[PDB]
Amino acid sequence: PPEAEVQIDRLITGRLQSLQTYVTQQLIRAAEIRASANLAATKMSECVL
Amino acid sequence: GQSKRVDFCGKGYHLMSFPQSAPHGVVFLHVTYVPAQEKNFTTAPAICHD
Numbered sequence: 001p002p003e004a005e006v007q008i009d010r011l012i013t014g015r016l017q018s019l020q021t022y023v024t025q026q027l028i029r030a031a032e033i034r035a036s037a038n039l040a041a042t043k044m045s046e047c048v049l
Numbered sequence: 050g051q052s053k054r055v056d057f058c059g060k061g062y063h064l065m066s067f068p069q070s071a072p073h074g075v076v077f078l079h080v081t082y083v084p085a086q087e088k089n090f091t092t093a094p095a096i097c098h099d
Contacts, residue, residue, distance in 0.1 A: 045056040 051065065052058045058066055061081030069076045 042057075046054055049055055 052063050057063075058077075059079030059081045061083040064080045064082055066080065067078045069078060
């Protein structure tokens with residue numbers, strides 16, 4: 001236990017960084033998608049209707 | 050101004066708007082013209098006179 005805990009904490013910290021990096025990138029990409037969706041909505045109103 | 054962008058300044062034909070203050074934001078009151086009662090008529094593209 002006391003030795004395993006050191007090695008496990010190193011892996012947990014790293015694993016958390018991998019997930020945090022993922023989430024941050026998804027948020028940035030989502031913002032870009034939102035902008036595209038807003039453009040599409042505008043076009044529907046102004047080009048289609 | 051008076052925007053001609055469809056559904057940009059509210060649904061219907063836009064006539065005018067009035068802003069109102071709100072905490073952390075803005076609220077717009079959009080005044081539009083909406084067709085109501087309607088009738089069905091026969092139509093034609095042109096009239097032939099002489």
